[PDB]
Ligand binder design. Structure first.
Ligand SMILES: O=C(O)CNC(=O)C(=O)O
Ligand SMILES: [Mg+2]
Ligand code: NI
Ligand SMILES: [Zn+2]
Length: 331
């Protein structure tokens, strides 16, 4: 069995290997990459996403979100307070202000220590889930707006044609902006490209061990767990690496830098934080191997998770027994 310790693997494809996206994902899996839940892909030196980032300041962040924490430094939830619209140039200025800017630090490990010590005492503002793309239309390789759609994959594997679309999303971050512990909708894959700016640190639990994280989360967030049998779908709970280690939860960590891709694999729980002002692009995708995970994915039906239009068909076809309860939670 390849990668039996479930380490995060880093890949350096050649320009020739960068042509066929599906083939390369399958290659990474042949080497055991999925066992970690997360892999890094460093593009060949010949590749670029676009020519420059000099002309992005006029993108609008219609609903910036202030991430307010509650709890203790290593075990907390966050809620998202809506703020007034601002442009990417305005948001960049805010991220660099004395109130929000990255503090002085020695290295990524020192900054990680500072994050976990101090995160809860601040409320950073995140531009999330902005439909759009920064890939140039002429970028032919690993262009996240030109991937094969999940609806086409389901039709190819299973024979059923379904409604829905699959487009990318932009994220504008600042110091301490946080992504809570989660798997993807319907336990899909994700791919994330860090277009510019400061790093993103990731934590991940191997898919084979995801239920260990879920059991800890139920213990640590006992009211939330009574409220919903899949409350991590709410995407609000944080648990630090120190707390994970104290509770024996298997996990790994890695820092993504500008110009690098990360892939999350089906049922790979992940969480993390941004080091400073940055911009990332991400999208969900599927392969044949996903279908069995989609059939078994948990679902939130309490009303909190609320998701895209295109998840309806996935539940309807892959999980017909759950569909009526889930759809009630959507309405
Ligand atoms: O970068 C972020 O805030 C969160 N991204 C992801 O969870 C992802 O790409 O799957
Ligand atoms: Mg612009
Ligand atoms: Ni994710
Ligand atoms: Zn719920």
């Amino acid at each position: 069995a390849q990668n039996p310790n479930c380490n995060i693997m880093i890949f350096h494809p050649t320009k020739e290997e960068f042509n066929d996206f599906d083939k390369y994902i399958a290659y990474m899996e042949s080497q055991g990459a999925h066992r970690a839940g997360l892999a890094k892909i460093i593009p060949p030196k010949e590749w670029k996403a676009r020519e420059t980032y000099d002309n992005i300041s006029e993108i609008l962040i219609a609903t910036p979100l202030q991430q307010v924490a509650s709890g203790r430094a290593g075990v907390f939830t966050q809620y998202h307070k809506k703020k007034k619209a601002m442009t990417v140039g305005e948001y960049r200025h805010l991220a660099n202000s004395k109130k929000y800017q990255t503090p002085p630090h020695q290295n990524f490990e020192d900054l990680e220590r500072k994050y976990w010590k101090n995160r809860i005492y601040n409320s950073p503002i995140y531009g999330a889930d902005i439909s759009g793309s920064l890939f140039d239309e002429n970028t032919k390789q690993w262009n996240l707006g030109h991937l094969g759609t999940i609806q086409d994959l389901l039709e190819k594997e299973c024979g059923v044609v379904i409604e829905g679309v699959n487009t990318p999303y932009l994220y504008f971050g600042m110091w301490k902006t946080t992504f809570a512990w989660h798997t993807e909708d319907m336990d899909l894959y994700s791919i994330n490209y860090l277009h510019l700016g400061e790093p993103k640190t990731w934590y991940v639990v191997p898919p084979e061990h995801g239920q260990r994280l879920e059991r800890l989360a139920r213990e640590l967030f006992p009211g939330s767990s009574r409220g919903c049998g899949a409350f991590l779908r709410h995407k609000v709970a944080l648990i630090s690496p120190t707390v994970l280690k104290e509770n024996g939860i298997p996990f790994n960590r890695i820092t993504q830098e500008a110009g690098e891709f990360m892939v999350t694999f089906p049922y790979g729980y992940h969480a993390g934080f941004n080091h400073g002002f940055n911009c990332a692009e991400a999208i969900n995708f599927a392969t044949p191997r996903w279908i069995d995970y989609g059939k078994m994915a948990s679902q939130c039906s309490c009303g909190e998770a609320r998701v895209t239009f295109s998840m309806d068909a996935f539940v309807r076809i892959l999980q017909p027994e759950r569909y009526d309860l889930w759809k009630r939670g959507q309405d």
